Design a protein around this ligand. Structure first.
Ligand code: ADP
Ligand code: ADP
Ligand code: ADP
Ligand code: ZN
Lengths: 439, 443, 45, 434
C-alpha cells in the first residue's frame, strides 16, 4: 500500500544481464530476453570491468531505436553492484553555463573512479546518570568535571578535559540520556532519553522519542565504509572548509595542479594499503549530441592511466557531426570511432516481443487473455514496442473501471481507439494542413 | 470580487461513473474522446504506480488542449502538486537548461509530514530561584530549580524549570512585565517585549509593545506540512544560518541558482525513504504540464529522453500546436509538432479536433453566463455565426466590449446593434492580414 | 517581583476632554491631548 | 525663463483622449485630430481597463508610420491619469544580460498591478529644545517645539539610551513613531544655523515643523506587486528596487505572493487595481518570448496589454517564417487589432496648428498652406519638425511672424528622406560599402 520514492519505470524489471557461469546468455532470465550477441558482448565487458586492470577502454552500442541499448546499460549497471561506482550522464548534461565542456567531461571522468576506505574507531555507547561541571569563578577559563556512565551490566566514571566539556554543553546533554562518545574525533551523537530516569522531570524542556539502554560492555568498536569519488576529493582540496560545493555544485574549472596532486596522493594511498582505489563505469547516453571539441577531448582523456571504462550509445546513421558539416558514421568523427569496440543490436521478432510483453505485465501486475496477448503483439509489430508496452497500463485501468479482473481484446481495442500512434496521428494530421502552424 | 480569467469556467471533465463523457458538464462541451482519455490519465495519476509516462495533446490552435490540462488539474484536487511550465522557461542566463528541467521535474513531487508543537508562553510575573535548604560540603547553598509564573488571558500558573535556564534568562533581558515563550522540545527562552498593559506608564519608550496572549499558557497542537522535493534541494544547497562568515557572506551577496549535483539527490532520496519506511511522511506524486513544448531545444529533448525512463520522474503532460515544423536547435530537420520522432515514440498522443457551430455557440453562452453577462438570442446567434466565420477566440473576446457599449446606451443586455458595432470597430487576424497584403507598399 | 500597577490611567487635565494624556504641557505643566486642549489650557491660565 | 526637467516633447501636446459621455470622439479636442474609429475603440478598451473585472486582455494598434499609434497610447495614458499603473516599455528593453527574456516580461507584468492598503499612523515631529536626565533606571524628560505649541515628554530609560546613542542636540528637528520608537533626524532649524561657523560632514537646514505635534490619522499606500516580489526575493531586497540587481526570482515566491494577496482581498484588508502594460514596437520580440505571452495572459491577475506594430507581412524575429505584423498566428487571435488610417489634408492642417500653439509659434495662412503641401508630399513628422527651425530662422531675421520665404529657406537647408536618397545615388561611389 505504501508508495516509496522508487516507482515502476520503463526499465524497472531488468535485474541484470541473465548470464550463466560460462558467460552464455539465456533466452529468458533476469528480465532480459533475446538479443543474444549484444548480451554476450556486454557480459564480456562486464567481466573485464570487474577484473579492473586496463584503463581508458571505450565501448559503443548501436542499433535501431527501441532495441534495448539502454536496457542493456541498465542491466549491466544492476549486475555490476551497488558498491561499484556507476555514473549515467545524458548527451546534453555537459553543456553548462558554469564550466567549460572539457571541464565538465573531466569532472564526469573523475566522478567514476572511487576510493574505498574502511574507518574503524573506538566508541563508548552508554546511558547518562549524572554530569559534573565545576565552572571557575575568575581564574583563566579552565574547567573541570566528571561524567558517570552506566549500562545494564557495568558502569564507570570518566574525567573530563577542557575540550569535550564545550561539546557537551553545545549539545545540551543532561541526565537520563543515551549517548555515543567518539574517542578519536570527540563528537557526541544523541540517541534519546531513557525510561526510568524520566520519572523525575521538571516542566517540558525536551520532548522527543524514546530509546532503550545499550546492553553489554560500555566500550566498543565501530566500523564505517566510505566510498569517495575522485571529483569530490578534488572539490574538497580545491578550497579551505569547502564542502557544500559537493551538493551546491558551485566549484567551477578547478585548477589542474590540484588534480595532479590528488592523483599522486591517491597513488601513495594505494601503495600504503590504507585505502583501495576501484575504477568505475561511465555511461554517456545519446552521445551523438556531443560537440566535436568534446569528442576530441575524449580522444586524449581516454589515454590516461586513471580514465574509466566509458560506454557510448547512439541510434543515428550517416549524420553530420554537431558543430561541423562533415558526415560520419554514428555522427562521430573517425578518430574517436577508431579507439573503441562497436556492439550492434538486431531488431526484435514476434516470439520475443510476446515474452517482453509478458514480463512487463508480470512487473506491472496485469493479466490478459491469450487473444489479448496476440492482439497486443500484432500492435507491437505493426507499431513500435514502446507503444505496446504503454498500452498495458491503460488497458488495465480501463478493465478495472468496468469492475473487471482480466483484460480482454475489447478493452485493448478501446484503448487503441482512444489514444493514438505517431503514424496514425500523422495520417490524421495531413487533413488539417491549413489548420496547423507553419507547415 | 475575484477577477474573471480566461479559463475560469473550466471546473472538470464531466464524466460518468462508467467514464463516458457527457455532452456538456462542468463547463466543457464536446471533445468526448479527449475527455475520456484525460479521465483515464487522471486514473493513472491517482494510481500511484507508474512514473515518467507522458501524454501529448495535439490539435489546432484554439481547440481546448490548454483547457483540458486545467480540467485535469481541477479534477485531481489540491493535495497533489501540479506544476505548469512553458517551453521558454528553460532558457536561463543563470543556469543550464537540463537543470531547469531537472528542478521542475523535482518540483512536481510533494511530501506531507506531520508533527506536534508544544510551547509554554505568556507574561512573566516573578522569578523565584527556589533553593534546597541544606547546602553541600564546601558551598553556601544548593539551588534546586527556578519557579516561573506565567499568566495569559485565561489564567496564571507556576512552572518549575531547570536552574540552567536562569543562565539564559540573564543572556537576554528577562524582567517582570515581559512576555516570553519556551519551546518544549527545544528548551530555549526568547523575549518578545513588554506587555501592552504597561504601554501608558511613559510618554516615549523606545520599545514597541505587544498584546497580552489569549489562550492557555501551555499550548500543544498537531500540524501537517507539505513540502515539494525541490524545496529540500534548495534548503540543503544553501544552508540558512547566521553564525558563519560563509552563510552570512552568501546571504549578503546576490543569490544565484546553482546546478545541484546528483549526489545531493542520492542522499535526500535515502533519508525520505527511511522516513517513509518509519511511517512518518507520506509521498504524493504529482503532474508537470509543459505547454508550447515546440519551443524546447534538441538538447532539452535529448535530456528528456533519459529523464522519462527514470523510476522517480512524475507524470508529464505535453501540449503543442505546430504542424510539420523545423526542430529548434537544428538546421532543416523537420518533424511533426516540431518534436523529434525518437522522443515522440515515448508519448501517448491525444488528438483534439475542431468545434462545430453548435458547440461554439454553447461555449459562447457558457462564457457569457460565467462572466455575468446577459445576451439576447438574436444577438447570440449572430455572434456564433461571426465566430464560425473567423474563430472561437474572436467571438468570445467581443462579449465584454458589447456589454460595455450596451451599458453605456443604458440597456441591460446586448442586442444586434451592439454586436455589429463592436465587430465594425475591432478587427480579426484574417481581415488585418488582408489589409496588410493590400497595403504592402506602405509598411 | 511585580511592581504595583495603577488603577486608572492618566487623563487630559481639561475636565471636558476624556482622552488620555498624550503629553504634559511645558509653560504651565499639565496633562494635555491635542491642539484644542492646549489652546484651552493656555487661555484659561 | 525657468526651465524644469521636462519640456516640449513630441507627444506633450496631447492631454487625455478626446471623447464624450457616450464615448463619441470629437473632431478636435484635447489635442487630437481625426482617428474617430481608433479613438472609439481606445475609449471602449479604456472603460474595460477602468472597470477591471476581466483579466488577461490584449489590444493591438496597427497602421502606417505617422498615423498616431503611439499618440493614441499616450492619450490613453493621460486620460487614465495617475492612481492606475501604466508601465510603458519598448520592444527591445527585455534583452538583458542578468535576466532572461522570461523574467524581463514577468517583472513587467507584475509591475502593472497595484495594491491599495490602509494604515493607521501616529507620528510626533518637532524641534528639540532641551533634554534633561538624572543620575540616581535613569529618568529624564525631553521638550519638543513647533509653530503652535511647546511640550515636554517624560520618556523612559530605553529612550534615554537611544537618544544618547543617536547623539541628539538642541536645535535638531526629529520625528519619532510612538508605535515603534525610532528617531529619524531630519536636520537643524534655520534659526539654529549660525552657532557653528564650520559645518560638519553632512548637515541640513530645514524649517521648523508647524501644526499639531502628535498627528494620528489614516494613510493609503499603493504598492506594485513587483515591489512585494523583490522585497521577499532575498534577505534585504529593497535595495534591488533601485539598484536593478534583482535577477530570476524563484517561482515559489510569486505563488506565495499571489496567495497572500488573494487572502488579503478576501479579508478586505487590501484591494487590487489592475493596470496597463504598453509594449511599443512589439514587432521585434523573440519567438521564444511570444510563446511566453500565451500562458501569461491566462492568469487570474494580469494587466491589459497594448501593443504597437509598424510591420506588415514580414519575417518573425528568431525564426524563418513570414507572418502578418511579425507576430505568430497562435497569439494574434488572442489580441484585438485596432487599425488606423492615413490623415487627410484637413487633418494635416488641423494637426500642425496644435503643435504651433504648443510651441507658442504664430504662422501665416500661406505658410500653413505650403507646410500642409510639404507634409502631404512628404512625411508628417518632417513637416512637424519644420516649424521649430522656422521659428529660429525668423528670429534671426528679427521678425515676429513667419512667412513663405522663411519656410522655403528652412526647406532648402535641411533635407528629407526622398531628397537625401536621390542625392545619395548621384555620388554613391564616394560612399562606403555600397
Ligand atoms: N532484451 C530485452 N529484455 C527486456 N526488455 C527489453 C529488451 N529490449 C528492450 N526492452 C524494453 O523495451 C523498452 C524500450 O527500449 P529502449 O531502452 O528505449 O531501447 P533503446 O534505448 O535502444 O531505444 C524498455 O523499457 C525495455 O524494458
Ligand atoms: N471543451 C470546452 N468547453 C468550454 N470552453 C472551451 C472548450 N475548449 C476550449 N474552450 C475555450 O476556448 C478558449 C481557448 O482555448 P485554448 O485552451 O486556449 O485552446 P489552445 O490550447 O488550442 O490554444 C478558452 O477560453 C476556452 O474557454
Ligand atoms: N490623432 C492625433 N492627434 C494629434 N496629433 C497626432 C495624432 N496622431 C499622431 N499625432 C502626432 O504625429 C506625430 C507622429 O505620430 P506617431 O505617433 O509617431 O506615428 P506612429 O503611430 O506611426 O508612430 C506625433 O508627434 C503625434 O503627436
Ligand atoms: Zn484634551
Amino acid at each position: 500500500d505504501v508508495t516509496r520514492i522508487e516507482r515502476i519505470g520503463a526499465h524497472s524489471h531488468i535485474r541484470g544481464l541473465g548470464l550463466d557461469d560460462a558467460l552464455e546468455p539465456r533466452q529468458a532470465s533476469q528480465g532480459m530476453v533475446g538479443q543474444l550477441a549484444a548480451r554476450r558482448a556486454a557480459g564480456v565487458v562486464l567481466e573485464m570491468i570487474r577484473e579492473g586492470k586496463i584503463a581508458g577502454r571505450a565501448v559503443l552500442i548501436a542499433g535501431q531505436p527501441g532495441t534495448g541499448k539502454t536496457a542493456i546499460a541498465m542491466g549491466m549497471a544492476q549486475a555490476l553492484g551497488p558498491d561499484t561506482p556507476f555514473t549515467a550522464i545524458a548527451g546534453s548534461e555537459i553543456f553548462s553555463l558554469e564550466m567549460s565542456k572539457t571541464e565538465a567531461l573531466t569532472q564526469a571522468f573523475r566522478r567514476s573512479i572511487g576510493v574505498r576506505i574502511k574507518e574503524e574507531t573506538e566508541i563508548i555507547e552508554g546511558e547518562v546518570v549524572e554530569i559534573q561541571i565545576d565552572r571557575p569563578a575568575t581564574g583563566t577559563g579552565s574547567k573541570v568535571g566528571k561524567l558517570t556512565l552506566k549500562t545494564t551490566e557495568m558502569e564507570t566514571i570518566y574525567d573530563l578535559g577542557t575540550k569535550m566539556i564545550e561539546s557537551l554543553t553545545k549539545d545540551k546533554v543532561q541526565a537520563g540520556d543515551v549517548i555515543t562518545i567518539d574517542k578519536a574525533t570527540g563528537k557526541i551523537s544523541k540517541l534519546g532519553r531513557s525510561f526510568t530516569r524520566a520519572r523525575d522531570y521538571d516542566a517540558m524542556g525536551s520532548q522527543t522519542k524514546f530509546v532503550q539502554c545499550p546492553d553489554g560492555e560500555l566500550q566498543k568498536r565501530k566500523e564505517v565504509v566510505h566510498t569517495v569519488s575522485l571529483h569530490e576529493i578534488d572539490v574538497i582540496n580545491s578550497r579551505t572548509q569547502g564542502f557544500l560545493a559537493l551538493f551546491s555544485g558551485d566549484t567551477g574549472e578547478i585548477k589542474s595542479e590540484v588534480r595532479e596532486q590528488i592523483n599522486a596522493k591517491v597513488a601513495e594511498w594505494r601503495e600504503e594499503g590504507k585505502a583501495e582505489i576501484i575504477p568505475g563505469v561511465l555511461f554517456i547516453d545519446e552521445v551523438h549530441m556531443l560537440d566535436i571539441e568534446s569528442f576530441s577531448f575524449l580522444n586524449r582523456a581516454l589515454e590516461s592511466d586513471m580514465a574509466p571504462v566509458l560506454i557510448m550509445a547512439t541510434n543515428r546513421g550517416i549524420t553530420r557531426i554537431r558543430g561541423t558539416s562533415y558526415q560520419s558514421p554514428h555522427g562521430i568523427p573517425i578518430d574517436l570511432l577508431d579507439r573503441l569496440l562497436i556492439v550492434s543490436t538486431t531488431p526484435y521478432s514476434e516470439k520475443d516481443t510476446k515474452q517482453i510483453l509478458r514480463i512487463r505485465c508480470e512487473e506491472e501486475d496485469v493479466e490478459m487473455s491469450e487473444d489479448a496477448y496476440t492482439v497486443l503483439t500484432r500492435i507491437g509489430l505493426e507499431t513500435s514496442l514502446r507503444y505496446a508496452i504503454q498500452l498495458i497500463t491503460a488497458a488495465s485501468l480501463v478493465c478495472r473501471k468496468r469492475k473487471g479482473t482480466e483484460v480482454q481484446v475489447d478493452d485493448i481495442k478501446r484503448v487503441y481507439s482512444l489514444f493514438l500512434d505517431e503514424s496514425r496521428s500523422t495520417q490524421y494530421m495531413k487533413e488539417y494542413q491549413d489548420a496547423f502552424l507553419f507547415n | 470580487t475575484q477577477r474573471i480569467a480566461s479559463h475560469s469556467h473550466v471546473k472538470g471533465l464531466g464524466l460518468d461513473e462508467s467514464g463516458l463523457a457527457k455532452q456538456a458538464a462542468s463547463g466543457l462541451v464536446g471533445q468526448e474522446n479527449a475527455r475520456e482519455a484525460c479521465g483515464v490519465i487522471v486514473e493513472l495519476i491517482k494510481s500511484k504506480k507508474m512514473a515518467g509516462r507522458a501524454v501529448l495533446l495535439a490539435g489546432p490552435p484554439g481547440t481546448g488542449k490548454t483547457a483540458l490540462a486545467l480540467a485535469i488539474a481541477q479534477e485531481l484536487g489540491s493535495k497533489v502538486p501540479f506544476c505548469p511550465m512553458v517551453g521558454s522557461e528553460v532558457y536561463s542566463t543563470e543556469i543550464k537548461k537540463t537543470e531547469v528541467l531537472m528542478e521542475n521535474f523535482r518540483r512536481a513531487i510533494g511530501l506531507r509530514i506531520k508533527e506536534t508543537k508544544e510551547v509554554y508562553e505568556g507574561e512573566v510575573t516573578e522569578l523565584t530561584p527556589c533553593e534546597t535548604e541544606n547546602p553541600m560540603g564546601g558551598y553556601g547553598k544548593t539551588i534546586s530549580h527556578v519557579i516561573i509564573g506565567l499568566k495569559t488571558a485565561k489564567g496564571t500558573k507556576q512552572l518549575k524549570l531547570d536552574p540552567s535556564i536562569f543562565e539564559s534568562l540573564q543572556k537576554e533581558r528577562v524582567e517582570a512585565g515581559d512576555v516570553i515563550y519556551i519551546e518544549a522540545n527545544s528548551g530555549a527562552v526568547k523575549r518578545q517585549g513588554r506587555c501592552d498593559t504597561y504601554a501608558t506608564e511613559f510618554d516615549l519608550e523606545a520599545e514597541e509593545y505587544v498584546p497580552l496572549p489569549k489562550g492557555d499558557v501551555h499550548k500543544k497542537k498537531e500540524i501537517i506540512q507539505d513540502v515539494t522535493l525541490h524545496d529540500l534541494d534548495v534548503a540543503n544547497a544553501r544552508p540558512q544560518g547566521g553564525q558563519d562568515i560563509l552563510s552570512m557572506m552568501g546571504q549578503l551577496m546576490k543569490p544565484k541558482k546553482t546546478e545541484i549535483t546528483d549526489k545531493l539527490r542520492g542522499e535526500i532520496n535515502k533519508v525520505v525513504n527511511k522516513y517513509i519506511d518509519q511511517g512518518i511522511a507520506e509521498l504524493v506524486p504529482g503532474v508537470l504540464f509543459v505547454d508550447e513544448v515546440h519551443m524546447l531545444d534538441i538538447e532539452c529533448f535529448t535530456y528528456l529522453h533519459r529523464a522519462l525512463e527514470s523510476s522517480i520522474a512524475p507524470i508529464v503532460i505535453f501540449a503543442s500546436n505546430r504542424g510539420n515544423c523545423v526542430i529548434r536547435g537544428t538546421e532543416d530537420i523537420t518533424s511533426p509538432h516540431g518534436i523529434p520522432l525518437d522522443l515522440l515514440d515515448r508519448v501517448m498522443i491525444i488528438r483534439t479536433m475542431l468545434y462545430t457551430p453548435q458547440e461554439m455557440k454553447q461555449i459562447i453562452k457558457i462564457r457569457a453566463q460565467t462572466e455575468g453577462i446577459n445576451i439576447s438570442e438574436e444577438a447570440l446567434n449572430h455572434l456564433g455565426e461571426i465566430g464560425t466565420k473567423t474563430t472561437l477566440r474572436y467571438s468570445v473576446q467581443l462579449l465584454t466590449p458589447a456589454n460595455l457599449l450596451a451599458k453605456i446606451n443604458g440597456k441591460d443586455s446586448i442586442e444586434k446593434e451592439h454586436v455589429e458595432e463592436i465587430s465594425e470597430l475591432f478587427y480579426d487576424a484574417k481581415s488585418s492580414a488582408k489589409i496588410l497584403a493590400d497595403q504592402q507598399d506602405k509598411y | 517581583q511585580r511592581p504595583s500597577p495603577s488603577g486608572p490611567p492618566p487623563r487630559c487635565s481639561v475636565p471636558g476632554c476624556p482622552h488620555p494624556r498624550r503629553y504634559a504641557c511645558s509653560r504651565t505643566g499639565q496633562a494635555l491631548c491635542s491642539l484644542q486642549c492646549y489652546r484651552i489650557n493656555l487661555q484659561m491660565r
